[PDB]
Design an enzyme around this catalytic site. Structure first.
Site, PDB file in Angstrom:
ATOM      1  N   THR A   1     -18.998  27.136 -41.172  1.00  0.00           N
ATOM      2  CA  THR A   1     -20.313  27.052 -40.539  1.00  0.00           C
ATOM      3  C   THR A   1     -20.671  28.345 -39.802  1.00  0.00           C
ATOM      4  O   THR A   1     -19.786  29.136 -39.464  1.00  0.00           O
ATOM      5  CB  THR A   1     -20.347  25.843 -39.569  1.00  0.00           C
ATOM      6  OG1 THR A   1     -20.089  24.637 -40.303  1.00  0.00           O
ATOM      7  CG2 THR A   1     -21.687  25.714 -38.858  1.00  0.00           C
TER       8      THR A   1
ATOM      9  N   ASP B   1     -22.940  40.268 -52.963  1.00  0.00           N
ATOM     10  CA  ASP B   1     -23.845  39.223 -52.516  1.00  0.00           C
ATOM     11  C   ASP B   1     -25.049  39.764 -51.765  1.00  0.00           C
ATOM     12  O   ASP B   1     -25.293  39.421 -50.611  1.00  0.00           O
ATOM     13  CB  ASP B   1     -23.124  38.168 -51.682  1.00  0.00           C
ATOM     14  CG  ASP B   1     -24.003  36.958 -51.411  1.00  0.00           C
ATOM     15  OD1 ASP B   1     -24.996  36.766 -52.150  1.00  0.00           O
ATOM     16  OD2 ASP B   1     -23.718  36.206 -50.460  1.00  0.00           O
TER      17      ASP B   1
ATOM     18  N   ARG C   1     -32.037  36.465 -48.536  1.00  0.00           N
ATOM     19  CA  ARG C   1     -31.064  35.731 -47.749  1.00  0.00           C
ATOM     20  C   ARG C   1     -30.240  36.627 -46.803  1.00  0.00           C
ATOM     21  O   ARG C   1     -30.438  36.611 -45.593  1.00  0.00           O
ATOM     22  CB  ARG C   1     -30.148  34.970 -48.713  1.00  0.00           C
ATOM     23  CG  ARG C   1     -28.937  34.336 -48.067  1.00  0.00           C
ATOM     24  CD  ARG C   1     -28.289  33.283 -48.954  1.00  0.00           C
ATOM     25  NE  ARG C   1     -27.507  33.863 -50.048  1.00  0.00           N
ATOM     26  CZ  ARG C   1     -27.958  34.102 -51.283  1.00  0.00           C
ATOM     27  NH1 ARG C   1     -29.214  33.830 -51.631  1.00  0.00           N
ATOM     28  NH2 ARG C   1     -27.136  34.624 -52.184  1.00  0.00           N
ATOM     29  N   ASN C   2     -29.351  37.439 -47.362  1.00  0.00           N
ATOM     30  CA  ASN C   2     -28.364  38.172 -46.553  1.00  0.00           C
ATOM     31  C   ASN C   2     -28.881  39.466 -45.907  1.00  0.00           C
ATOM     32  O   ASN C   2     -28.097  40.364 -45.576  1.00  0.00           O
ATOM     33  CB  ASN C   2     -27.113  38.466 -47.393  1.00  0.00           C
ATOM     34  CG  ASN C   2     -26.474  37.205 -47.951  1.00  0.00           C
ATOM     35  OD1 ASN C   2     -26.477  36.976 -49.164  1.00  0.00           O
ATOM     36  ND2 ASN C   2     -25.937  36.369 -47.063  1.00  0.00           N
TER      37      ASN C   2
ATOM     38  N   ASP D   1     -23.291  39.624 -43.987  1.00  0.00           N
ATOM     39  CA  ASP D   1     -22.542  38.739 -44.872  1.00  0.00           C
ATOM     40  C   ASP D   1     -21.665  39.515 -45.857  1.00  0.00           C
ATOM     41  O   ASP D   1     -22.036  39.740 -47.008  1.00  0.00           O
ATOM     42  CB  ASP D   1     -23.467  37.751 -45.597  1.00  0.00           C
ATOM     43  CG  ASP D   1     -22.701  36.613 -46.253  1.00  0.00           C
ATOM     44  OD1 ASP D   1     -21.736  36.100 -45.634  1.00  0.00           O
ATOM     45  OD2 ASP D   1     -23.065  36.231 -47.388  1.00  0.00           O
TER      46      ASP D   1
HETATM   47  C1  LIG Z   1     -31.890  32.419 -43.493  1.00  0.00           C
HETATM   48  C2  LIG Z   1     -31.802  31.881 -42.025  1.00  0.00           C
HETATM   49  C3  LIG Z   1     -30.576  32.369 -41.290  1.00  0.00           C
HETATM   50  O1  LIG Z   1     -29.478  31.913 -41.538  1.00  0.00           O
HETATM   51  N1  LIG Z   1     -30.770  33.352 -40.304  1.00  0.00           N
HETATM   52  C4  LIG Z   1     -29.930  34.104 -39.406  1.00  0.00           C
HETATM   53  C5  LIG Z   1     -28.658  34.573 -39.749  1.00  0.00           C
HETATM   54  C6  LIG Z   1     -27.889  35.322 -38.839  1.00  0.00           C
HETATM   55  C7  LIG Z   1     -26.601  35.819 -39.109  1.00  0.00           C
HETATM   56  N2  LIG Z   1     -25.904  35.552 -40.319  1.00  0.00           N
HETATM   57  C8  LIG Z   1     -24.494  35.694 -40.510  1.00  0.00           C
HETATM   58  C9  LIG Z   1     -24.037  35.431 -41.797  1.00  0.00           C
HETATM   59  C10 LIG Z   1     -22.698  35.571 -42.114  1.00  0.00           C
HETATM   60  C11 LIG Z   1     -21.792  35.967 -41.141  1.00  0.00           C
HETATM   61  F1  LIG Z   1     -20.514  36.100 -41.469  1.00  0.00           F
HETATM   62  C12 LIG Z   1     -22.216  36.226 -39.841  1.00  0.00           C
HETATM   63 CL1  LIG Z   1     -21.079  36.717 -38.622  1.00  0.00          CL
HETATM   64  C13 LIG Z   1     -23.565  36.082 -39.532  1.00  0.00           C
HETATM   65  N3  LIG Z   1     -25.931  36.547 -38.140  1.00  0.00           N
HETATM   66  C14 LIG Z   1     -26.485  36.803 -36.909  1.00  0.00           C
HETATM   67  N4  LIG Z   1     -27.742  36.319 -36.629  1.00  0.00           N
HETATM   68  C15 LIG Z   1     -28.432  35.596 -37.583  1.00  0.00           C
HETATM   69  C16 LIG Z   1     -29.686  35.148 -37.244  1.00  0.00           C
HETATM   70  C17 LIG Z   1     -30.438  34.404 -38.136  1.00  0.00           C
HETATM   71  O2  LIG Z   1     -31.683  33.969 -37.769  1.00  0.00           O
HETATM   72  C18 LIG Z   1     -32.059  33.498 -36.472  1.00  0.00           C
HETATM   73  C19 LIG Z   1     -33.380  32.771 -36.502  1.00  0.00           C
HETATM   74  C20 LIG Z   1     -33.113  31.435 -35.832  1.00  0.00           C
HETATM   75  O3  LIG Z   1     -31.875  31.529 -35.138  1.00  0.00           O
HETATM   76  C21 LIG Z   1     -31.101  32.447 -35.903  1.00  0.00           C
HETATM   77  C22 LIG Z   1     -31.973  31.332 -44.599  1.00  0.00           C
HETATM   78  N5  LIG Z   1     -30.708  31.176 -45.374  1.00  0.00           N
HETATM   79  C23 LIG Z   1     -29.769  30.230 -44.724  1.00  0.00           C
HETATM   80  C24 LIG Z   1     -30.929  30.728 -46.769  1.00  0.00           C
END
Ligand SMILES: *[C@@H](CC(=O)Nc1cc2c(Nc3ccc(F)c(Cl)c3)ncnc2cc1O[C@H]1CCOC1)CN(C)C
Length: 299
Positions: A30, A142, A146-147, A160
């Protein structure tokens, strides 16, 4: 022949941070929202957290410990880094919260605000990151809207590194041997042979951008993964986005070449958009065009 790594890897007590909201989960584990409250220091810090499913699978632990190293290492305006790590049983990755979040979402919302100068200044930054990664022998496997995340609409960063694999000296590619994948994204080379290169990564930088210009749009919507190969072989790809001048869309088609070294390198994608950047209205056509916490970016 490489200099000293000199990176920092921050180990954290599980107490220093608290997880607030859920963003995503699958088989891996998660990713939480959360905010980090550094030991001693009374300063709150927005972060995002990726926890993993299991605690004791040898190679799984091997995999993540690599993913950390890579993210700790990188230093690029447009590449997200690892804040730190919690080394608790089910290992957790701490990482800097990007306020506006993944760049896919962000276009699905603000499209009626979203304009030409941005969609091109964004593509430039993605190319800069991917090319910066290429500079450091690193392959992503990847890419996808998305990423990509949004620090601020005038700036995006790449996250990611869960499918990344670093390459050796003479090595120019990497063969996978089974695993869950984004099929409607990776290259045909990668689908039938499990081969990956930087030139496989471009392809997706294609799909990625195709996703940008269409404003989210699901690639191969409906159509399943079980003949994507067959389909590509016959020679169908994703259609010109309406707003895309041919000059731009072309580049997407240069990235869907079945030949790998016919595909543009990030070095040259950069320029093809930095160019378009100076006169963004002549390459994209978007009717209605000219219409006590701390951020952590302080050591
Ligand atoms: C995109 C929405 C989403 O998940 N947004 C989002 C991601 C994010 C991340 N991602 C991340 C992924 C892998 C990983 F190993 C790590 Cl350490 C982090 N990292 C930091 N901040 C993030 C912010 C974020 O957004 C913000 C908006 C609402 O609150 C979070 C849709 N996909 C899920 C398809």
């Amino acid at each position: 022949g490489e200099a000293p790594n000199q990176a920092l890897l921050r180990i954290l007590k599980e107490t220093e941070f608290k997880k607030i909201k859920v963003l995503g989960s699958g088989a891996f584990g998660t990713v939480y929202k959360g905010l980090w409250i550094p030991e001693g220091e009374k300063v709150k810090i927005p972060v995002a957290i990726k926890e993993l499913r299991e605690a004791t699978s040898p190679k799984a632990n091997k995999e993540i410990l690599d993913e950390a190293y890579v993210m700790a290492s990188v230093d690029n305006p447009h590449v997200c880094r690892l804040l730190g790590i919690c080394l608790t049983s089910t290992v957790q990755l701490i990482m800097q919260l990007m306020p506006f979040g993944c760049l896919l979402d962000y276009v699905r919302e603000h499209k009626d605000n979203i304009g030409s100068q941005y969609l091109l200044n964004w593509c430039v930054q993605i190319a800069k990151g991917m090319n910066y990664l290429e500079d450091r022998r690193l392959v992503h496997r990847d890419l996808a809207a998305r990423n990509v995340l949004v620090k601020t609409p005038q700036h995006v960063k790449i996250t990611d590194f869960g499918l990344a694999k670093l390459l050796g000296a003479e090595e120019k590619e990497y063969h996978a041997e089974g695993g869950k994948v984004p099929i409607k994204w990776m290259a045909l080379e990668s689908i039938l042979h499990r081969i990956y290169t930087h030139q496989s990564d471009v392809w997706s930088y294609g799909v990625t951008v195709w996703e940008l210009m269409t404003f989210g749009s699901k690639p191969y919507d409906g159509i399943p993964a079980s003949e994507i190969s067959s389909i590509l072989e016959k020679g169908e790809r994703l259609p010109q986005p309406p707003i895309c001048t041919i000059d731009v869309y072309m580049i997407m088609v240069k990235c869907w070449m079945i030949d790998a070294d016919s595909r543009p390198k990030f070095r040259e994608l950069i320029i093809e958009f930095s160019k378009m950047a100076r006169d963004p209205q002549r390459y994209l056509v978007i009717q209605g065009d000219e219409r006590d916490v701390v951020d952590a970016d302080e050591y």
